[PDB]
Design an enzyme around this catalytic site. Structure first.
Site, PDB file in Angstrom:
ATOM      1  CB  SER A  47      68.167  31.479 -24.155  1.00 48.00           C
ATOM      2  OG  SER A  47      67.950  30.911 -22.858  1.00 48.00           O
ATOM      3  CE  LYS A  50      72.149  30.307 -22.183  1.00 39.35           C
ATOM      4  NZ  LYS A  50      70.754  30.630 -21.897  1.00 39.35           N
ATOM      5  CB  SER A  94      69.171  27.236 -24.372  1.00 36.38           C
ATOM      6  OG  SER A  94      69.021  27.650 -25.717  1.00 36.38           O
ATOM      7  CD1 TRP A 187      59.358  29.725 -23.676  1.00 39.12           C
ATOM      8  CD2 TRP A 187      59.858  27.617 -24.259  1.00 39.12           C
ATOM      9  NE1 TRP A 187      58.238  28.955 -23.476  1.00 39.12           N
ATOM     10  CE2 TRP A 187      58.518  27.659 -23.821  1.00 39.12           C
ATOM     11  CE3 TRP A 187      60.397  26.393 -24.671  1.00 39.12           C
ATOM     12  CZ2 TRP A 187      57.704  26.518 -23.784  1.00 39.12           C
ATOM     13  CZ3 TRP A 187      59.588  25.263 -24.640  1.00 39.12           C
ATOM     14  CH2 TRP A 187      58.254  25.334 -24.199  1.00 39.12           C
ATOM     15  NE  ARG A 227      61.232  28.048 -29.878  1.00 43.16           N
ATOM     16  CZ  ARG A 227      62.074  27.757 -28.892  1.00 43.16           C
ATOM     17  NH1 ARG A 227      62.616  28.736 -28.179  1.00 43.16           N
ATOM     18  NH2 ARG A 227      62.377  26.496 -28.625  1.00 43.16           N
TER      19      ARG A 227
END
Ligand code: ZN
Ligand code: ZN
Length: 241
Positions: A47, A50, A94, A187, A227
């Site tokens: 993602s 994006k 996401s 992810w 993360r």
């Protein structure tokens, strides 16, 4: 440094996975973590793509920043995705299906041209316009992700200034102590091993830009919040935040 470099390495060790954090200021990069070779290894962007998808869609008027992408009523991976939402909403969530619709509006020919014009990773999107950033063939290294984020932060990507500003707004997380934080997580759970990402930048109080890209292996039992936690803790330890 060694002592802050050693604490970042141990942040990754305490999370029981391997990872790297790439930092960029000006044209120089430094890597930290417990597997520095990840910095020049290719992974699917997941993602984090994006960011570039939105730039392309807005640049070529396949979407506006206020446009609502309608849920079509089909079951989606998460109930939170089963809503009408903007590209900005879908960026924070996401929400893959929204950006798959966007990718189909852009179409393969224009998508492939823009990815190669920007020079994004291996710049290979293959033949399937709505999943090439999830299952391949598109791949990018953490060094290239931090470089991409730096150019977006400085609005030096080959898009209009207005479109880069709009995508920056979609990525804004917070401002604390004069530091503006922008980031996009990723992810890639459809590849093995699974890749985890957090790419973005800090605008320091004088306007100085510190771009970053965290990249680690998402193993089972590793919560998704690792993360952001490692990124923020590392940025604090480097005095960036
Ligand atoms: Zn432990
Ligand atoms: Zn166009």
């Amino acid at each position: 440094s060694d002592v802050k470099a050693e604490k970042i390495k141990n942040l990754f060790n305490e999370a029981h996975t391997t990872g790297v954090l790439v930092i960029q200021q000006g044209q120089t990069q430094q890597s930290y973590g417990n597997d520095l070779a990840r910095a020049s290894t290719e992974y699917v962007p997941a993602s984090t793509f994006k960011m570039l998808n939105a730039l392309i869609g807005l640049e070529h008027h396949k979407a506006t920043t206020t446009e609502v992408f309608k849920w079509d009523g089909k079951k989606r991976l998460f109930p939170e995705w089963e809503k009408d939402m903007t590209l900005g909403d879908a960026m924070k969530a996401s929400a893959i299906p929204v950006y798959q619709d966007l990718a189909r509006r852009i179409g393969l020919e224009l998508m492939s041209k823009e990815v190669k014009r920007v020079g994004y990773g291996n710049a290979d999107i293959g033949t399937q316009v709505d999943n090439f950033w999830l299952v391949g063939p598109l791949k990018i290294t953490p060094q290239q992700e931090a470089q991409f984020a730096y150019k977006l932060a400085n609005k030096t990507l080959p898009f209009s200034q207005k479109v880069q500003d709009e995508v920056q707004s979609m990525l804004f997380i917070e401002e604390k102590n004069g530091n503006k934080i922008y980031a996009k997580s990723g992810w890639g759970w459809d590849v093995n091993p699974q890749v985890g990402w957090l790419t973005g930048w800090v605008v320091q109080p004088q306007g100085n830009i510190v771009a970053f890209s965290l990249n680690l292996e998402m193993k089972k039992g590793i919560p998704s919040s690792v993360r952001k936690e490692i990124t923020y803790k590392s940025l604090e330890q480097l005095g960036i935040l």
